[PDB]
């Protein structure tokens, strides 16, 4: 079973990436299961809705009283050394919030790191239905 652990915000980097202090050490975290338009995209640079997704994530983590990270069942860091987790701000999952607002698409998922896949696909279906941002 998955469980939440405390962390402290250092700095928000992009819509899909945030730097946190986890267990007394600075780390860069990549949000699990979501794909957001980017401001620092290697080839494309600043994509459409990139500034929007980036501002949303920043506001959510900066205004929170408690930040918690929830690792999935598989590997905990990717090839770039970024932690892979579901991030919660005062009990609300940031990953789901972005998808629900049409500021992110559910990424090409791959087990075992796919516990909340169905939950996120449902939120994406609702965002499409409502024609929000990305889907407008």
Short mmCIF file of C-alpha atoms in Angstrom, two decimals, residues 12-136:
data_model
loop_
_atom_site.label_atom_id
_atom_site.label_comp_id
_atom_site.label_asym_id
_atom_site.label_seq_id
_atom_site.Cartn_x
_atom_site.Cartn_y
_atom_site.Cartn_z
CA UNK A 12 8.73 25.36 -8.47
CA UNK A 13 10.49 24.85 -11.82
CA UNK A 14 7.87 24.07 -14.47
CA UNK A 15 4.32 22.74 -14.68
CA UNK A 16 5.59 19.16 -14.27
CA UNK A 17 8.65 19.69 -12.05
CA UNK A 18 9.23 21.02 -8.51
CA UNK A 19 12.30 21.11 -6.23
CA UNK A 20 11.73 19.88 -2.66
CA UNK A 21 13.63 19.03 0.53
CA UNK A 22 12.88 15.35 1.16
CA UNK A 23 14.39 13.63 4.22
CA UNK A 24 16.87 16.45 4.69
CA UNK A 25 18.14 16.57 1.11
CA UNK A 26 17.35 18.83 -1.91
CA UNK A 27 15.73 16.92 -4.79
CA UNK A 28 14.00 17.61 -8.10
CA UNK A 29 10.62 15.83 -8.45
CA UNK A 30 8.86 14.97 -11.73
CA UNK A 31 5.06 14.59 -11.43
CA UNK A 32 3.94 11.02 -12.16
CA UNK A 33 1.54 10.20 -15.02
CA UNK A 34 1.05 13.66 -16.52
CA UNK A 35 2.29 15.59 -19.54
CA UNK A 36 2.15 19.37 -19.35
CA UNK A 37 3.00 21.98 -22.01
CA UNK A 38 6.45 23.30 -21.11
CA UNK A 39 8.28 26.62 -20.72
CA UNK A 40 11.68 24.93 -20.92
CA UNK A 41 11.15 22.37 -23.67
CA UNK A 42 14.49 21.20 -25.24
CA UNK A 43 13.27 21.59 -28.84
CA UNK A 44 10.04 23.64 -28.73
CA UNK A 45 11.03 26.11 -26.00
CA UNK A 46 7.79 27.65 -24.68
CA UNK A 47 4.69 25.69 -25.78
CA UNK A 48 1.09 26.94 -25.77
CA UNK A 49 -0.46 26.76 -22.27
CA UNK A 50 3.05 26.23 -20.87
CA UNK A 51 3.06 29.47 -18.82
CA UNK A 52 -0.45 28.64 -17.60
CA UNK A 53 0.39 25.12 -16.33
CA UNK A 54 3.59 26.46 -14.79
CA UNK A 55 1.73 29.22 -12.89
CA UNK A 56 -0.94 26.76 -11.68
CA UNK A 57 1.61 24.33 -10.15
CA UNK A 58 3.60 27.20 -8.60
CA UNK A 59 0.56 28.77 -6.94
CA UNK A 60 -0.65 25.41 -5.59
CA UNK A 61 2.63 24.45 -3.89
CA UNK A 62 3.63 27.93 -2.72
CA UNK A 63 0.33 28.54 -0.89
CA UNK A 64 0.13 25.12 0.81
CA UNK A 65 0.49 24.54 4.56
CA UNK A 66 1.66 20.95 4.13
CA UNK A 67 3.32 19.28 1.16
CA UNK A 68 3.43 15.46 1.01
CA UNK A 69 4.93 13.07 -1.52
CA UNK A 70 3.54 9.64 -2.35
CA UNK A 71 5.82 7.26 -4.27
CA UNK A 72 4.24 4.53 -6.42
CA UNK A 73 5.01 0.76 -6.35
CA UNK A 74 7.90 0.80 -8.83
CA UNK A 75 11.15 2.73 -9.20
CA UNK A 76 11.39 6.02 -7.31
CA UNK A 77 13.75 8.05 -9.54
CA UNK A 78 14.05 8.38 -13.34
CA UNK A 79 17.22 8.40 -15.48
CA UNK A 80 17.81 12.11 -14.80
CA UNK A 81 17.79 11.52 -11.05
CA UNK A 82 14.36 13.07 -10.52
CA UNK A 83 12.06 11.55 -7.90
CA UNK A 84 8.85 10.10 -9.35
CA UNK A 85 5.78 10.71 -7.19
CA UNK A 86 2.24 11.96 -6.68
CA UNK A 87 2.47 15.35 -4.94
CA UNK A 88 -0.18 16.49 -2.45
CA UNK A 89 -0.78 20.11 -1.32
CA UNK A 90 -3.02 20.20 1.77
CA UNK A 91 -4.49 16.83 0.83
CA UNK A 92 -5.15 17.64 -2.83
CA UNK A 93 -3.14 15.81 -5.51
CA UNK A 94 -1.40 18.32 -7.77
CA UNK A 95 -1.14 15.70 -10.56
CA UNK A 96 -4.94 15.27 -10.69
CA UNK A 97 -5.67 19.00 -10.35
CA UNK A 98 -3.68 19.80 -13.54
CA UNK A 99 -5.50 17.09 -15.55
CA UNK A 100 -8.90 18.20 -14.21
CA UNK A 101 -8.25 21.80 -15.44
CA UNK A 102 -7.22 20.73 -18.94
CA UNK A 103 -3.63 21.86 -18.28
CA UNK A 104 -2.18 18.36 -18.68
CA UNK A 105 -2.82 15.07 -20.51
CA UNK A 106 -2.39 11.63 -18.96
CA UNK A 107 1.02 10.38 -20.15
CA UNK A 108 1.76 7.03 -21.81
CA UNK A 109 1.57 4.97 -18.63
CA UNK A 110 3.69 1.91 -17.79
CA UNK A 111 3.40 -0.44 -14.81
CA UNK A 112 4.19 -0.81 -11.99
CA UNK A 113 4.03 3.00 -11.59
CA UNK A 114 0.38 3.29 -12.62
CA UNK A 115 -1.72 2.99 -9.46
CA UNK A 116 -3.76 6.19 -10.05
CA UNK A 117 -4.06 5.79 -13.81
CA UNK A 118 -7.82 5.10 -13.91
CA UNK A 119 -8.50 7.98 -11.52
CA UNK A 120 -6.60 10.42 -13.77
CA UNK A 121 -8.12 9.13 -17.03
CA UNK A 122 -11.55 9.84 -15.55
CA UNK A 123 -10.58 13.43 -14.69
CA UNK A 124 -9.17 13.91 -18.21
CA UNK A 125 -12.40 12.65 -19.76
CA UNK A 126 -14.28 15.28 -17.72
CA UNK A 127 -11.88 18.06 -18.78
CA UNK A 128 -12.32 17.07 -22.47
CA UNK A 129 -16.10 17.00 -22.03
CA UNK A 130 -15.99 20.53 -20.58
CA UNK A 131 -13.60 21.75 -23.34
CA UNK A 132 -11.11 23.25 -20.90
CA UNK A 133 -7.87 24.99 -21.95
CA UNK A 134 -5.94 22.32 -23.87
CA UNK A 135 -9.27 20.93 -25.12
CA UNK A 136 -10.86 24.29 -26.02
#
